[PDB]
Design a protein that fits this description.
CATH superfamily: K Homology domain, type 1
Subcellular location: Cytoplasm; Nucleus
Largest sheet: 3 strands, antiparallel
Order of helices and strands: EHHEEH
CATH topology: Ribosomal Protein S8, Chain: A, domain 1
Function: Appears to play a role in cell sterol metabolism. It may function to protect cells from over-accumulation of cholesterol.
Strand order of the largest sheet: 1-3-2
CATH class: Alpha Beta
Number of strands: 3
Protein name: Vigilin
PDB class: transport protein
Radius of gyration: 19 Å
Shape: elongated
Keywords: K homology type I domain, RNA-binding, cell sterol metabolism, beta-alpha-alpha-beta-beta-alpha structure, Structural Genomics, nppsfa, National Project on Protein Structural and Functional Analyses, RIKEN Structural Genomics/Proteomics Initiative, rsgi, transport protein
Number of helices: 3
Length: 95
């Protein structure tokens, strides 16, 4: 018999990279802001990515972001820092 296999690769790549993160809804509202500024600014500063936030009603603590990885990675690292910061309590955490 003959398997007939090959050893070649393909240029499988995607322009847009959808990355999700684990964040509570209690923080979302805060991150988003009153007029979607805290988020709007980040979307621009980073480049112009899109961020999707779940509705408290549904009960989903997951966020979906769209855009170029190069930026997505920046928008994510920014959301994490803030999300955590927002949480006001005794003994803050530096980063």
């Amino acid at each position: 018999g003959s398997s007939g296999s090959s050893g070649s690769i393909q240029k499988d790549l995607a322009n847009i990279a959808e990355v999700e993160v684990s964040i509570p809804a209690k923080l979302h509202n805060s991150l988003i802001g009153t007029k979607g500024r805290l988020i709007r600014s980040i979307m621009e500063e980073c480049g112009g990515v899109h961020i999707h936030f779940p509705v408290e009603g549904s009960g989903s603590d997951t966020v979906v972001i769209r855009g170029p990885s190069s930026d997505v990675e920046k928008a994510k690292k920014q959301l994490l820092h803030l999300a955590e910061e927002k949480q006001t309590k005794s003994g803050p955490s530096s980063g």
